[PDB]
A = this chain, B = another copy of it.
């Protein structure tokens, strides 16, 4: 709508990550008034517009990037697998902590060593691996509220934050997005729709 002009300054910017080893990282999600992303229109256009401006998407057409540290996901027999077959959808990059004994066709494996301290995955190292090993110049992370909750803390990684808020309450039992500490924003910009609003911003510090 007027949405492309609104998003423009927050889209991956070529000359900004070029001659760096990190990709542009956008953090994006859709929540209710009570900050829930699940429970216990018009956003299609925007999401698909955003996706086609990124090389990878962490959950032309973007490549799917899946975290599967515990190694239990499978490509064969996935929506993704079928989409790949019909010439409209790329095969996934699968993020793991060690080399899997059994690998699937078309699937790329990114071995990211779990962080020494946090005991979680080293987000900085993972994003460099995606960029350097797999030509992923930009990445749109869409969810796992737990992924979002960690990355909200990473002002040194995240480049743009794009949040849709719908005019509804999902209820307290729904899965929330809220960082463990306070997170300040900068360079904020709001767009308003009929029933929804979108925030574009950056992470302070």
Show the binding face of A for B, using Cβ within 8 Å. Answer: 33-36, 39-40, 149, 152, 163, 165, 167-174, 176-185, 188, 190-195, 197, 199, 201
Per DSSP, are chain A's interface residues mostly helix, strand or loop, or mixed? Answer: loop
Give the 6 A-B residue pairs with the shortest CB-CB distance, closest first.
A34-B178, A169-B183, A35-B35, A172-B178, A190-B192, A167-B188
Q: How many copies does the complex hold?
A: 2
Q: How far is the CB of A102 from chain B (nearest CB, A)?
A: 36
Residues of chain B contacted by A177 (CB below 8 angstroms): 34
Q: Is the Cβ of A182 less than 8 Å from the Cβ of B171?
A: yes
* Cβ contact of A171, chosen from B174, B179, B192, cutoff 8 A: B179
Expressed in whole angstroms, the Cα–Cα distance for A199 and B181 within the complex equals 26
Residues of chain B contacted by A39 (CB below 8 angstroms): 182
Expressed in whole angstroms, the Cα–Cα distance for A179 and B34 within the complex equals 8
Residues of chain B contacted by A165 (CB below 8 angstroms): 33, 165, 197
